[PDB]
Design a protein around this ligand. Structure first.
Ligand SMILES: COc1cccc2onc(N)c12
Length: 109
């Protein structure tokens, strides 16, 4: 069940990330109205709702595709927001959590 092993593992990892107390800024797409100039600077927006959909839609056929999207959630945030903002802080906390979980799961060697 090599496809469903991957799916299972990713779903677990994604749920844990979504349940984390620092995930709240990333739960839905950034709104243009709340972020002036966001979509002019961030070319590939990503969020955890979209990732959930992608997962359900069987898009994440490799660990690399999953990693790229979730990494993008953090890097987008860090480019856009000031370094001591609450959003920037949440990104790094959640990113630390993400790297531990992917290492825990044996997704990167
Ligand atoms: C509440 O989410 C936001 C609102 C406005 C700007 C944002 O940048 N990164 C975010 N996660 C974000």
């Amino acid at each position: 069940r090599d496809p469903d092993q991957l799916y299972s593992t990713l779903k677990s990892i994604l749920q844990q990330v979504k349940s984390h107390q620092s995930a709240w800024p990333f739960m839905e797409p950034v709104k243009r109205t709340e972020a002036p100039g966001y979509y002019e600077v961030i070319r590939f927006p990503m969020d955890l709702k979209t990732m959930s959909e992608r997962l359900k839609n069987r898009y994440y056929v490799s660990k690399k595709l999953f990693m790229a999207d979730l990494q993008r959630v953090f890097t987008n945030c860090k480019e856009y927001n000031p370094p001591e903002s609450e959003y920037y802080k949440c990104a790094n906390i959640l990113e630390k959590f993400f790297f531990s979980k992917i290492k825990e799961a044996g997704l990167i060697d």
